[PDB]
Amino acid sequence: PLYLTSSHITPQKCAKFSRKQEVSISTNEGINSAWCFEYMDPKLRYEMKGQPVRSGEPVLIKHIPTCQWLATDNVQYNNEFGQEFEVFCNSYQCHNKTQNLIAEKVGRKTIETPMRNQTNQNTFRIVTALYP
Amino acid sequence: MREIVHIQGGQCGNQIGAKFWEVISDEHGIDPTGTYHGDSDLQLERINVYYNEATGGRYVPRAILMDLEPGTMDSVRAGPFGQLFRPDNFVFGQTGAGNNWAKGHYTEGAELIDSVLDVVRKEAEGCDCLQGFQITHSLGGGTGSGMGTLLISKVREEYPDRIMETFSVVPSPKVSDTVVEPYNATLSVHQLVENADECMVIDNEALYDICFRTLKLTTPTYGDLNHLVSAAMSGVTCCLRFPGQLNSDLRKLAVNLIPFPRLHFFMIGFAPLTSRGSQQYRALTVPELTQQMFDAKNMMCAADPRHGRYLTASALFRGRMSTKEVDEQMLNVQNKNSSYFVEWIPNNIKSSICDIPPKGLKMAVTFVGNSTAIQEMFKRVAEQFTAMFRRKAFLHWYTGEGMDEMEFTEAESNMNDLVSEYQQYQDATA
Amino acid sequence: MSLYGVGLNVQVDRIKTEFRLYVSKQKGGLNVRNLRRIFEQLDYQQNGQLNLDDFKAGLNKFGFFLKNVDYQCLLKYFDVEQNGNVNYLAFLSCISQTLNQRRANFVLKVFDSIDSEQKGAVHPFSLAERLEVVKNKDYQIGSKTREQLVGEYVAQFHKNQDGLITRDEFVSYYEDLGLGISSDQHFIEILQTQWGIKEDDDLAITKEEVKGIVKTIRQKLIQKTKGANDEFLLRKLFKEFDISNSGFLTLDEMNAMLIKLEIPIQKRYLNAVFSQLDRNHSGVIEFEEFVYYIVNDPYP
Amino acid sequence: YTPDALSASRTFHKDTIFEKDYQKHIPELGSKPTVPKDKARPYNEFTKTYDSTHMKIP
Amino acid sequence: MREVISIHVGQGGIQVGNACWELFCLEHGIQPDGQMPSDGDDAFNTFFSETGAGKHVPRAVFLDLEPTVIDEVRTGTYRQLFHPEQLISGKEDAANNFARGHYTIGKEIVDLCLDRIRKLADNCTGLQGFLVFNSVGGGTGSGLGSLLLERLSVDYGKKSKLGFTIYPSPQVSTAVVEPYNSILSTHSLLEHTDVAVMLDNEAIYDICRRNLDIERPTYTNLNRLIAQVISSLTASLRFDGALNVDITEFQTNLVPYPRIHFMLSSYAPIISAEKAYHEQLSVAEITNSAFEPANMMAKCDPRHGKYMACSMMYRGDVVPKDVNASIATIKTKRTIQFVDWCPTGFKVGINYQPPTVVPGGDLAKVMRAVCMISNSTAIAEVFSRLDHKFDLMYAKRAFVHWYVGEGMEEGEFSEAREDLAALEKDYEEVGIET
Amino acid sequence: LKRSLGGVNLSYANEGLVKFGYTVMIESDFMNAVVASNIWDKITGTEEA
Ligand SMILES: Nc1nc2c(ncn2[C@@H]2O[C@H](COP(=O)(O)OP(=O)(O)OP(=O)(O)O)[C@@H](O)[C@H]2O)c(=O)[nH]1
Ligand SMILES: Nc1nc2c(ncn2[C@@H]2O[C@H](COP(=O)(O)OP(=O)(O)O)[C@@H](O)[C@H]2O)c(=O)[nH]1
Ligand SMILES: [Mg+2]
C-alpha cells in the first residue's frame, strides 16, 4: 500500500519547481496521511462540518498535521508520461489583510469562522463512474 | 517543570516566533488545532516545557506577542498554525513606533507596557517552576528595540535570579533598510548590555550567504531564513526537553560559556546544511559535522572569527552516537587550531549529547561561541553612529520626546568600554 | 447530582462501580447471576418491568443499599419506555464484564479438556467426576446412585433441550462468577486448583523489553568499522545470502543475520520483534524497510 | 581450465548457522539467569545475630 | 551477616549504578521484575533485602537534582525492581556549580536523603560500610557528595567509606569549569573519605580500543567495565574462597597514613569473545598484564613513583602455588620497585566464583580474573595538573563571580589550594629513603 | 507503458454520496485535469516516495 502524504516545509526539502510544500506517495502509515474534506464557500465552511459529502461538488482538500490545502498551478514538469504539471500544498488566500484580532477583541467574529477568500486554484472535483 | 516562556515583539520578532512555533509543534507532533498526534511517548513526557494544558486535552503555547501596530500580528493570525496562540496573548497599540527608539521607549511603550507586564506576570506565576526567558527581536526597528528592551529591564528588575536570553537580529551596513539604524541600535545595545544574561547575534547577510552558497538555493524567501533561525533556537534546548547522554540546561551553558559578567555576546551556527541535490553524495559522520562546525564560512554573524580568538565554545549534538570520537575530535581541533584559541583558558569547549535527532535527519550540531572577533560590528556601528551624530542629523525626532544628547553620550561610552575590554581579554597572556 | 445532561451518565456510572466494588468486597457466595433468578419471583408476569418499590426491595434483599437520590437516578436512566418502571433486564445487561482474554483462554482450555469428543457440548454427569475427584483421594470410582448424588456439584448451569451443557453457558457462568472475583491471578488460582490443571503462558513480550533489545542491536552495529559505513556492512550479508535476489527477508534469515552479528536473541523475542516490524503479516521483511527502521528512525 | 564453480569461490560467511566457533559459547541474550550452585562463604551459625532476641539482653 | 550501602549521586553516579546493579541482579539470578523463578543458600543479603513475598529490594539510593535520568530509571526495564521512594529527584540542576549544590539547593534534599539512609540502615544490623559513586567534575554530584560525606561522618562516625570518584581527564574534558569544583570536592573529601578510587574515562577508553577492538565505545561499555570491577571487588563478601577479605581489612593493608587514602585500580583480563579461544589465559600472564602500565584504568604511570601497598584479588580456579610464583616473578622484575620502608606489601585474596558474562556485553567468558588496587606516589601528577589548571584560572579571577554570587565566600579557593599543596608535599615526603 | 496504461473500472455512486471503499477520480478544476502518480520516478529522499 502507498499513501499520499506531506511533511512541513524545509529548505533542505523544497519542491523542485514550485519550491513549496511537497506531496509524496510514500510507504509511511503515520499521521501524515490524515486528509480532510472541506466545503468550498467561505460562509459555510464551519457549519458544513458533520454533513455528508456528495460526489461531483467543488471541494477542498486539507492536511491535518499542517492545515495546508492541496492545489496545483501551471508549473512545468517532465517525466515519462508526457508533459505534466505540479501538485503541492499551499495557501492561495487573497492578499488583503483583515483585522481578525480586533474583531476578536470587540467580539464580532470567532476564529473557527474564516474571513479570507481563497482563489479558484484550490478547487478539486471528485469524479465517480458514469454508469453502474 | 523547569519550563521557559516566550515573549516576542516587533515585525521581525513576530516573524521569527511564528516559524519557531511551527517547527516546535511539528517536532512535538501537535496539529494546528492543538491535539497531540505523536508516535512515541517520549514526545509527551516533557511537553509541559513549552505548552500549557487545556480542556479537551489540547495545548497552548506560552508566548506573548507584543507590538504597537496590529498589522504584522493581524497577518500572522490568519496563516497556518495561527490558532495555537490564545487570543489574550496579543497586545498592541493604535499609533505605531515610526522606527523611533524615543517613541518606542518613552511615550507609547511606557503607557502601553502595563498590560503586557500584567499578562507576563500572570503567566510566570502560573508556571510551576520558571526556568528562564527567551526574547527574539531586532535592533534596527523602533518598537522592538525600544519597548522589548524596556520589558527586559522591568522583568530583570522583577526577577533578578532567572536566566535571560535574547536573539537580536542586528542589521548590517552592507544592505540596510533603515537610515536611523545606528541610533536605535546603539541605544538598544547600551540598555541591553546591563540586563541580558545572554546575547545571540544574528546577521541577515550571513543567512543570505549560507542559504545561497551552502543550500545552493537560487530563490529563497524570508521563510527559509526564519526556518534556519528557528532550528538554531530550538537546538540549544534540545537536551533540556529530551533525553541524552549529557544533559546541559541553559544555566549550565551560561556558566560554562561566560567567564566574565559583561562578555555575554555570542555567535551561533547550525550543521549540517546541504542542498537536496547533494544529499545522496554526502556521508553524515562526526568528522564531517565537526568540520562543518568550526568553519568561519558557516557562522550566522558577519564577524570573521579568524580575526580573533575563541574565548569559549559549546557543542550540542543531536542523534545517537558514542562520545569517544566526539572527544578526540574536540581535542584534535583544539590542538591544530591553538592559535585561534585564547591561551589562558585551556580546553575552552563544552560538549553535550542528546539522543533525539531532528525529524528528517540522523545527526545534528548546534554551535554557540563567545569570541573576541565580535567587536568588529561594534566598532562599525559606533563609527556609523558618530558619523551621523557629528552633524546632529535626525536628532530632532529623538529630542521631541524629552531625550537629550547625554544618553547618546554614555551609550557611546558603554560601547567604547566594551570594545576596549574585548581587546584586553584577547591580548591578555599568562 | 444536578443530572441535567450527561450528569445522568456520571451518576449511574458510580452506581455501577459501587455495585461492582461491593460484589468484589463480598468475594464469596454473592453472585451477580443470583439477581437474575431473584427478579423473576417479583416479576410475576415476566413483562420485564418492575416498579420502584419492588426494585428497592429486591436490591435490599441482596444487600446493596443506596440513597433515595440514587434510586431516582437509576429509575430515570433505566426507565426506557417512560412508564415509571425500571427494566431489570436492561439493568443486568449492564454492570457485566466481557471478560479478560487470559480468563477466556483459561476457561476455554478447561472446557476443551473435558470435551475431548469436541462436539461442543458436555454431559452434566461428566463434570461431576472431575469436580469430586479433585476434592477427594478416596472417593472411589463407583457410587451407588452416583448420578443424582453428585449432580449437586452441577446444575448451577443450565442444559439445552438435549440436556448437554453448552460451552456458551459454561463461559457465561464463569464470567458471572468472575465479577466478585476481579483478579486475574487469584481467579486463575481458583480455576486451576478446582480443575486440577496447571498450564498457562509464562509471559507476553513487553514493550520496554522490545525497546531495550532494539536499542542493543541498534548500538551494536555502530561499534564496527566507521561512522558512514554499517549500511554497506548490513547490505553485504543480504547480498551474501539472498539467492533469489527478490529482496525479501524471512524469520530464519533474520535469525541467521543476528547470529552472524553477535546477537543471539531468543526465538520468542525474535518473533516479537519480527511481528512488531511487519504490518503486512506476510512473514517477510523488506530489506530497505528494515534498514531504514534500524538506522534512520528519530524515535527510539 | 575453469575455476570449478563460482560457488567454489570463497565467501566471508556461509549457510552454516554456526559459521565460526567464536560465537557458539557466547551468551544468548533473553535467557533466564541461573541460580548459583553450592558455592558461597559458610554462614549458618551467625543467624543468632539476626535473631531478634540478641538485643534487649537484660 | 554483611550488608553494604551503595550511594549513587550525579548523572555519572546514576549511570554507573544502573550498570552495576544490572550485573548484580544477573549474578544473583534475579529477574528484572525482582522475582525469583522457582529453581546452597543465597547470601544475597549484601545487595538485596527480601520483602517476605519474593520481591527483593536493592540496598541503594539514587540522588540527583536533574530528573531526566531518574525518570528514565523509573521508565525503563527496571521499574518494578527499585523501591519507588528511594529514588530521590530534585527540581533544578546545579548547572556544574559546586556552591549551588553545596550551599543553596542541596540543603532541602539532604534531609530527605538522610532520612531515607537511616530508614535503609535500620534494617541492616550487620552493615559493613558505604560505597559512593559520583563524577567529581559535575556540580550537583560534587556538591551533594561533599555534603553527604560531611553529614555521614558525624552521623555514623567510624563506618568505613569508599568513594569511586570520576576525576576529569587531564587533556580532554566535557565542561570547562571543572577544576574549581574538582579541587573543592577533593579538599572536602580528604578528611571525610576512608578510601578513594580514580575513575577517569580516557584510560578506560584506551583499554577498550586496545583490547576490545571497539573503535567508537560509548559510556555504556565504560559503565560495564566499572560494574565488572566492583563485582570482582565485592565477590569475596558473598562467595567462598581460599582466602577471604572484607572491606574492614582495607585500611589496614592499604592506608599507611590517614592522609594518604587514594588508591588506583587495575583489572584483567580484558578479552573479547573473538579473542578468548586463541588465548590460554594463564594466571601468570594475566598478572603480568595487570601490572603493565597501559593496562591501568587511570592516567597515572606507576613507574614514575614508588609502591606502598598492593592488594590483588583472584576469582576462578587459581592455585596459591602459581599465585606465589607469579608474585615472585613480579618481585624479580626490575621495572617495578617498592618503597624502602615496606618489605612486604602484597595482600592476596582468592574467590571460587568465576566472573559472569553479561548478554549484550563485550567481555568474553573466562575462568580466571584479577582485580587490583595499589598505592603509588605517582598519583601526585594528576593533582599537580589540577593545580596548574586552577592557577591558570584563578590568576585572572575567571568564573569567580559564578561562585561568589550564591553564598560561598572567596576564601575557599585559597584554603583548598593550600591543602592540595600540602598533599603534594606529603606524597613526596613519603617517598624519601630513610 | 503497459503496466501504466492498464484497464480499470470505477465504482458507481448511488444517490451521489461518496462512501468509503470506492474507486474515484480526483480532478483539479483550475487545471481541468485529473491527478495521476509516477511510481517509476523516485523522489530525492531516504524514504521511498
Ligand atoms: N565514567 C563516567 N563518567 C560520567 C558518566 N556520566 C557523566 N560522567 C562525567 O560527569 C561529567 C559531567 O557531569 P555530569 O555527570 O554529566 O552531571 P553531574 O555530575 O550530575 O553534575 P551536573 O552537571 O551539575 O548535573 C562528565 O565530564 C563526565 O566525565 C558516566 O556515565 N560514566
Ligand atoms: N530574517 C528575517 N528578518 C526580518 C524579517 N522581517 C523583518 N526582518 C528584519 O527586520 C528589520 C526591520 O525591523 P523592524 O520591522 O523595523 O523592527 P520593528 O520596528 O520592531 O517591527 C529588517 O532589517 C529585516 O532584516 C524576516 O521575516 N526574516
Ligand atoms: Mg548532572
Side-chain angles (χ1 to χ4, degrees):
Chain A
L2 290 185
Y3 313 148
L4 189 153
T5 56
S6 296
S7 67
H8 42 296
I9 297 89
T10 311
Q12 291 291 142
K13 296 183 290 294
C14 53
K16 186 181 287 185
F17 295 72
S18 178
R19 288 285 171 216
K20 205 39 67 185
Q21 172 52 255
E22 311 295 30
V23 298
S24 56
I25 300 298
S26 57
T27 49
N28 188 359
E29 56 90 23
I31 320 298
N32 290 318
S33 66
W35 273 117
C36 282
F37 263 81
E38 190 40 64
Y39 183 76
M40 183 278 288
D41 63 358
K43 308 288 203 203
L44 282 72
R45 273 202 200 61
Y46 153 80
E47 41 265 40
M48 282 316 81
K49 187 269 183 182
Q51 289 299 341
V53 176
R54 64 171 301 91
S55 165
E57 295 291 323
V59 286
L60 278 299
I61 306 165
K62 63 197 300 154
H63 199 199
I64 295 299
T66 81
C67 278
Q68 195 59 262
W69 313 267
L70 187 153
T72 186
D73 272 345
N74 313 276
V75 174
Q76 214 80 52
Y77 173 97
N78 197 2
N79 56 43
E80 314 95 310
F81 301 153
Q83 193 65 34
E84 292 171 349
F85 312 149
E86 294 293 328
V87 180
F88 52 81
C89 295
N90 186 81
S91 191
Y92 279 94
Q93 284 159 45
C94 183
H95 283 312
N96 63 274
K97 63 173 62 44
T98 60
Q99 289 72 62
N100 50 8
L101 310 154
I102 297 156
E104 271 315 327
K105 302 199 314 307
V106 173
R108 274 191 221 120
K109 164 279 182 183
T110 305
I111 299 301
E112 51 267 15
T113 61
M115 306 178 39
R116 216 182 261 261
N117 180 15
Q118 48 87 32
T119 191
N120 221 335
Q121 183 178 2
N122 208 3
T123 316
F124 268 94
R125 303 321 291 261
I126 301 299
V127 176
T128 187
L130 274 297
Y131 67 85
Chain B
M1 187 66 204
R2 60 172 144 170
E3 59 267 52
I4 61 159
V5 311
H6 193 287
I7 297 89
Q8 64 200 57
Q11 177 182 130
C12 198
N14 287 296
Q15 293 300 124
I16 302 300
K19 212 177 199 181
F20 168 71
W21 284 117
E22 301 136 10
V23 176
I24 196 67
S25 303
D26 291 331
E27 182 285 329
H28 267 255
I30 303 301
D31 59 356
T33 62
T35 303
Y36 170 82
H37 271 317
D39 317 289
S40 178
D41 54 355
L42 277 296
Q43 290 274 19
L44 208 65
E45 57 88 18
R46 211 83 58 188
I47 196 179
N48 55 4
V49 170
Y50 280 114
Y51 299 93
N52 277 326
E53 284 272 37
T55 59
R58 70 186 274 124
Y59 302 77
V60 300
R62 65 185 69 190
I64 296 93
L65 301 168
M66 61 80 71
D67 191 8
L68 277 296
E69 184 67 26
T72 300
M73 294 182 286
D74 212 357
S75 176
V76 77
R77 189 62 178 295
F81 284 121
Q83 294 82 17
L84 294 175
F85 318 112
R86 64 182 176 90
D88 295 9
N89 284 6
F90 303 87
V91 287
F92 62 92
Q94 296 297 109
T95 52
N99 278 57
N100 174 223
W101 201 91
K103 263 156 65 151
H105 195 276
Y106 278 162
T107 60
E108 294 294 328
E111 56 85 20
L112 179 138
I113 206 156
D114 61 21
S115 64
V116 65
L117 180 60
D118 192 328
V119 71
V120 69
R121 187 180 291 119
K122 183 178 184 293
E123 192 276 331
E125 312 307 336
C127 65
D128 190 1
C129 176
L130 203 172
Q131 211 271 350
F133 303 79
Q134 69 273 16
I135 309 299
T136 77
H137 69 267
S138 80
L139 261 55
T143 176
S145 75
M147 182 178 72
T149 192
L150 199 152
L151 212 61
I152 297 169
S153 65
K154 307 313 291 312
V155 301
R156 183 40 62 154
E157 286 157 289
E158 297 200 1
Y159 296 80
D161 45 24
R162 299 295 188 267
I163 307 96
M164 185 180 288
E165 52 205 56
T166 177
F167 293 76
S168 296
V169 309
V170 65
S172 65
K174 283 78 61 179
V175 291
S176 66
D177 64 354
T178 55
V179 302
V180 65
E181 184 262 1
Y183 286 4
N184 56 8
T186 57
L187 271 63
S188 55
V189 67
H190 158 64
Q191 289 299 111
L192 187 153
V193 70
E194 295 107 357
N195 308 296
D197 289 330
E198 293 83 3
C199 295
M200 296 336 305
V201 177
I202 300 299
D203 291 331
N204 271 185
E205 325 301 320
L207 294 174
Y208 284 149
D209 186 74
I210 306 285
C211 183
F212 175 74
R213 294 201 309 83
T214 305
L215 275 294
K216 313 294 304 311
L217 199 152
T218 185
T219 180
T221 179
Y222 285 164
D224 291 331
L225 317 163
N226 290 318
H227 193 247
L228 281 83
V229 176
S230 66
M233 181 185 318
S234 87
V236 65
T237 178
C238 295
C239 66
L240 184 63
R241 286 174 287 114
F242 286 107
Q245 304 194 34
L246 274 298
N247 303 317
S248 64
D249 57 28
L250 291 191
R251 210 197 274 285
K252 185 186 289 187
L253 294 174
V255 65
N256 277 278
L257 202 73
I258 52 172
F260 289 102
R262 292 186 85 234
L263 280 71
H264 54 53
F265 282 79
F266 319 131
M267 65 182 179
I268 62 170
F270 186 78
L273 282 72
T274 56
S275 65
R276 176 158 88 272
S278 180
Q279 303 176 263
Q280 281 80 32
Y281 304 90
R282 264 197 69 163
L284 277 296
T285 183
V286 192
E288 290 293 328
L289 290 174
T290 187
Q291 280 164 110
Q292 186 63 256
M293 181 146 198
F294 282 163
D295 204 325
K297 194 262 211 193
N298 200 7
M299 295 298 102
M300 291 155 158
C301 298
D304 192 356
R306 195 169 39 274
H307 292 171
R309 278 200 202 66
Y310 279 100
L311 183 62
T312 61
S314 174
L316 276 293
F317 290 83
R318 293 189 85 191
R320 44 189 160 128
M321 185 63 72
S322 61
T323 77
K324 188 73 172 292
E325 66 278 15
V326 182
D327 291 331
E328 69 273 15
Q329 285 291 333
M330 295 298 102
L331 189 151
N332 208 46
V333 71
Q334 204 148 0
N335 273 350
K336 261 72 73 175
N337 284 17
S338 68
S339 171
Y340 298 140
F341 278 14
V342 59
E343 190 276 331
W344 40 271
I345 186 69
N347 189 358
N348 56 4
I349 176 63
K350 178 49 151 33
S351 66
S352 88
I353 300 295
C354 170
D355 291 333
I356 305 303
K359 214 172 71 83
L361 292 175
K362 51 184 304 312
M363 294 177 71
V365 173
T366 314
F367 164 75
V368 64
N370 188 354
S371 186
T372 62
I374 197 167
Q375 58 172 350
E376 207 288 325
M377 61 79 71
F378 288 141
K379 324 163 191 93
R380 89 182 176 197
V381 162
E383 190 277 331
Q384 282 164 100
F385 173 75
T386 187
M388 293 183 286
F389 191 60
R390 46 177 52 245
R391 294 298 275 285
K392 318 194 299 204
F394 304 83
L395 276 296
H396 68 285
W397 293 114
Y398 284 77
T399 61
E401 302 81 16
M403 191 205 304
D404 52 356
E405 293 83 3
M406 321 325 297
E407 297 76 71
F408 290 103
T409 313
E410 69 274 15
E412 179 61 40
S413 177
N414 210 316
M415 290 179 70
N416 291 137
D417 291 331
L418 184 63
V419 67
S420 177
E421 71 204 290
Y422 266 111
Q423 193 73 253
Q424 319 303 130
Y425 288 135
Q426 73 89 31
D427 58 41
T429 44
Chain C
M1 73 291 291
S2 179
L3 61 84
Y4 164 75
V6 171
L8 280 296
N9 289 139
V10 63
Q11 184 49 241
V12 299
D13 287 330
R14 65 181 292 275
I15 302 300
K16 172 178 180 292
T17 73
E18 301 146 321
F19 188 81
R20 292 261 290 103
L21 191 152
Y22 161 89
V23 175
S24 306
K25 181 141 285 195
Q26 197 277 332
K27 91 179 171 61
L30 271 66
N31 202 320
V32 67
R33 185 178 290 275
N34 294 40
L35 271 298
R36 304 193 53 68
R37 64 200 90 160
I38 200 68
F39 287 106
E40 284 102 12
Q41 310 167 359
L42 276 297
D43 293 337
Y44 293 9
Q45 66 285 329
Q46 288 74 238
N47 269 32
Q49 310 254 18
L50 291 174
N51 70 61
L52 185 60
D53 305 350
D54 313 327
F55 191 38
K56 193 187 293 187
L59 292 178
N60 291 5
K61 165 64 61 63
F62 194 56
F64 185 63
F65 290 88
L66 295 174
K67 62 173 54 47
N68 290 318
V69 182
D70 188 358
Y71 290 143
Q72 310 283 341
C73 182
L74 308 192
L75 186 143
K76 272 298 297 296
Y77 191 24
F78 284 163
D79 175 39
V80 62
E81 191 276 331
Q82 67 265 13
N83 57 20
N85 296 319
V86 61
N87 187 0
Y88 65 95
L89 290 175
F91 176 22
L92 271 295
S93 47
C94 185
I95 75 170
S96 65
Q97 187 63 42
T98 176
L99 194 47
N100 194 346
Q101 60 88 29
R102 184 176 178 180
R103 311 197 197 193
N105 268 345
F106 212 70
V107 64
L108 293 183
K109 68 94 178 179
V110 159
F111 182 84
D112 295 323
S113 85
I114 306 157
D115 178 54
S116 87
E117 65 276 15
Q118 318 201 7
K119 71 186 184 293
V122 171
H123 187 34
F125 181 56
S126 65
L127 302 193
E129 280 97 16
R130 273 258 291 277
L131 260 64
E132 167 59 26
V133 298
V134 298
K135 197 178 75 179
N136 289 294
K137 294 190 289 183
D138 58 355
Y139 168 69
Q140 73 78 28
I141 290 302
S143 177
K144 280 75 65 179
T145 303
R146 190 172 77 178
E147 280 265 355
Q148 188 274 331
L149 294 174
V150 194
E152 57 87 18
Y153 283 152
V154 291
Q156 66 281 346
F157 298 161
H158 296 285
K159 68 185 182 67
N160 53 12
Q161 306 325 308
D162 189 359
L164 281 298
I165 299 303
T166 314
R167 187 175 183 177
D168 65 358
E169 185 170 2
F170 192 100
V171 66
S172 175
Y173 173 86
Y174 287 169
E175 154 58 34
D176 292 332
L177 189 143
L179 206 46
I181 306 314
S182 73
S183 181
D184 283 2
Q185 184 45 37
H186 155 265
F187 182 80
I188 295 303
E189 287 289 330
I190 291 173
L191 266 298
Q192 70 190 359
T193 61
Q194 197 264 344
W195 295 104
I197 315 297
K198 263 52 184 177
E199 68 88 19
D200 201 292
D201 170 34
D202 280 31
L203 57 91
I205 308 316
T206 186
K207 59 167 310 204
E208 65 272 15
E209 202 277 342
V210 175
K211 303 271 268 166
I213 296 299
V214 69
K215 180 45 183 284
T216 54
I217 62 170
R218 204 181 209 227
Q219 188 274 331
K220 286 302 293 296
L221 61 83
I222 301 296
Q223 299 183 93
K224 300 287 102 176
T225 187
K226 319 298 161 262
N229 175 340
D230 314 332
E231 183 175 3
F232 307 74
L233 193 143
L234 183 62
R235 293 184 188 276
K236 196 268 291 183
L237 271 293
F238 181 76
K239 178 176 172 65
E240 192 277 325
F241 69 110
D242 191 70
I243 301 299
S244 67
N245 299 113
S246 287
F248 295 96
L249 289 172
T250 70
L251 194 75
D252 62 358
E253 283 153 1
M254 185 180 288
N255 189 359
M257 311 265 268
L258 287 202
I259 290 170
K260 275 82 155 179
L261 277 296
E262 308 320 298
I263 296 160
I265 301 299
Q266 300 300 148
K267 186 43 65 197
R268 54 173 323 173
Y269 291 125
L270 178 137
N271 296 115
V273 65
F274 201 81
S275 66
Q276 194 275 330
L277 293 175
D278 64 349
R279 275 69 174 174
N280 322 116
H281 211 307
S282 284
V284 285
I285 299 298
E286 297 82 3
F287 182 76
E288 172 275 359
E289 187 263 329
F290 172 73
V291 168
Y292 163 83
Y293 165 85
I294 192 66
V295 167
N296 298 319
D297 205 24
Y299 285 31
Chain D
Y1 163 73
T2 186
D4 291 331
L6 183 62
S7 59
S9 64
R10 271 208 176 224
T11 51
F12 75 87
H13 272 317
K14 292 180 287 294
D15 291 330
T16 59
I17 195 66
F18 293 99
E19 295 80 18
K20 294 183 177 178
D21 54 358
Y22 275 11
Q23 46 259 46
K24 59 160 49 48
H25 312 67
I26 62 172
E28 190 276 331
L29 282 72
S31 87
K32 62 91 176 179
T34 61
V35 63
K37 277 74 69 177
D38 303 337
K39 49 181 81 74
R41 44 181 301 200
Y43 158 50
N44 198 7
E45 289 179 350
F46 286 91
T47 60
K48 58 186 72 65
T49 50
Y50 303 133
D51 186 75
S52 63
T53 63
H54 69 279
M55 61 79 70
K56 82 181 182 180
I57 51 171
Chain E
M1 172 85 218
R2 52 213 69 81
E3 292 82 62
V4 65
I5 300 301
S6 69
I7 313 301
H8 296 96
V9 304
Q11 183 185 341
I14 294 156
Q15 278 194 153
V16 173
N18 189 359
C20 65
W21 275 116
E22 181 275 359
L23 183 63
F24 303 146
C25 177
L26 193 143
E27 182 65 26
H28 278 280
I30 301 299
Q31 285 157 15
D33 66 356
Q35 187 271 349
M36 261 312 315
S38 183
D39 296 331
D41 207 317
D42 266 330
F44 71 89
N45 288 156
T46 302
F47 288 78
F48 311 91
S49 178
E50 195 275 333
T51 182
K55 184 57 202 301
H56 307 286
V57 186
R59 297 177 187 268
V61 70
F62 284 7
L63 277 300
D64 188 353
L65 273 295
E66 208 264 333
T68 297
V69 295
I70 191 166
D71 270 1
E72 300 303 17
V73 174
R74 313 181 194 165
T75 310
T77 179
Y78 287 121
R79 307 180 320 96
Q80 303 304 109
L81 174 60
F82 289 94
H83 158 64
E85 300 86 308
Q86 68 182 356
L87 271 67
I88 295 90
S89 67
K91 190 63 57 63
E92 300 303 19
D93 182 19
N96 273 129
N97 190 356
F98 184 89
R100 283 208 85 200
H102 198 294
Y103 286 99
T104 298
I105 302 95
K107 310 274 181 63
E108 293 82 3
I109 201 167
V110 69
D111 62 345
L112 266 297
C113 182
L114 265 294
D115 185 20
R116 282 328 302 259
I117 291 294
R118 180 76 273 173
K119 183 64 55 63
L120 199 81
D122 68 0
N123 274 296
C124 310
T125 187
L127 188 153
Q128 296 294 320
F130 298 94
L131 294 174
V132 290
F133 303 77
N134 62 319
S135 74
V136 172
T140 178
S142 69
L144 277 296
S146 299
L147 210 54
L148 274 295
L149 289 171
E150 296 188 11
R151 299 276 320 248
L152 294 174
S153 295
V154 68
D155 199 310
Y156 286 74
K158 65 162 310 302
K159 298 293 183 182
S160 53
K161 279 176 280 317
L162 285 78
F164 309 132
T165 61
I166 296 89
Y167 291 80
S169 168
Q171 64 264 16
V172 76
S173 175
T174 62
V176 300
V177 65
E178 70 288 335
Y180 277 42
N181 51 9
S182 70
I183 296 89
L184 291 175
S185 286
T186 61
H187 164 65
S188 177
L189 69 90
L190 177 74
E191 69 273 20
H192 283 301
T193 54
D194 291 330
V195 164
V197 183
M198 295 317 90
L199 292 176
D200 55 15
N201 299 275
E202 70 278 16
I204 62 171
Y205 281 161
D206 189 359
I207 294 303
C208 182
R209 60 88 174 173
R210 186 267 182 275
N211 304 59
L212 291 203
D213 294 330
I214 305 183
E215 292 184 354
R216 299 153 279 170
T218 183
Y219 274 60
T220 77
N221 297 115
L222 319 177
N223 300 318
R224 294 229 158 95
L225 267 292
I226 297 169
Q228 215 62 70
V229 164
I230 188 63
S231 53
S232 167
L233 276 296
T234 308
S236 66
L237 283 72
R238 48 215 166 88
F239 297 102
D240 63 301
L243 264 65
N244 295 115
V245 292
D246 308 333
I247 70 167
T248 182
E249 295 276 329
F250 274 24
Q251 80 97 27
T252 54
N253 298 52
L254 277 179
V255 187
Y257 305 104
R259 286 261 295 179
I260 45 172
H261 50 70
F262 299 88
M263 283 73 74
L264 72 164
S265 66
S266 176
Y267 194 83
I270 304 300
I271 293 296
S272 67
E274 62 89 18
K275 187 60 186 179
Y277 295 151
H278 287 134
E279 285 288 329
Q280 190 264 326
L281 286 171
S282 178
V283 54
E285 88 186 333
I286 69 165
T287 56
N288 288 302
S289 87
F291 272 129
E292 194 275 332
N295 286 115
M296 181 36 48
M297 283 74 75
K299 298 293 183 182
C300 179
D301 208 35
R303 44 194 297 105
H304 280 162
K306 300 289 94 175
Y307 262 60
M308 283 73 74
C310 174
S311 161
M312 73 291 291
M313 293 177 71
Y314 294 148
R315 66 188 318 205
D317 56 355
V318 297
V319 56
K321 64 92 175 179
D322 271 298
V323 173
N324 301 345
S326 180
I327 292 298
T329 290
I330 298 314
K331 303 191 53 73
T332 299
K333 68 173 70 174
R334 280 289 86 186
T335 179
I336 301 301
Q337 65 183 177
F338 280 56
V339 66
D340 184 73
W341 45 265
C342 188
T344 174
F346 287 121
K347 172 82 165 139
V348 56
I350 290 149
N351 199 353
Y352 276 140
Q353 185 81 19
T356 60
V357 58
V358 63
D362 62 358
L363 277 296
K365 174 50 58 199
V366 293
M367 59 289 299
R368 290 169 277 278
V370 62
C371 64
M372 185 66 204
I373 188 72
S374 63
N375 266 307
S376 176
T377 58
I379 199 67
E381 65 181 0
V382 303
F383 293 141
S384 68
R385 258 186 275 94
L386 262 59
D387 193 351
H388 188 63
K389 292 288 187 69
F390 174 83
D391 289 300
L392 273 174
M393 293 326 168
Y394 193 61
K396 293 201 266 302
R397 296 291 186 272
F399 289 141
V400 171
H401 67 289
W402 272 118
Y403 297 80
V404 171
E406 69 275 16
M408 153 187 78
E409 96 285 358
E410 190 270 331
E412 293 293 329
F413 307 99
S414 70
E415 53 204 280
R417 174 41 70 231
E418 180 266 358
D419 210 331
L420 188 152
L423 270 295
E424 286 164 350
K425 299 289 94 176
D426 290 306
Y427 292 166
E428 317 183 281
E429 177 167 32
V430 74
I432 296 93
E433 298 88 3
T434 62
Chain F
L1 284 194
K2 80 176 194 291
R3 184 51 290 160
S4 48
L5 272 297
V8 73
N9 280 318
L10 282 71
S11 65
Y12 193 73
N14 277 332
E15 68 271 14
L17 299 199
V18 180
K19 293 197 259 159
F20 293 99
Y22 313 147
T23 295
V24 298
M25 282 315 78
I26 56 153
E27 183 155 82
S28 176
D29 189 358
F30 182 76
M31 294 298 102
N32 299 115
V34 290
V35 176
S37 69
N38 188 349
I39 178 171
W40 311 93
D41 291 331
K42 181 83 148 294
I43 205 168
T44 312
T46 186
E47 194 276 334
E48 69 276 16

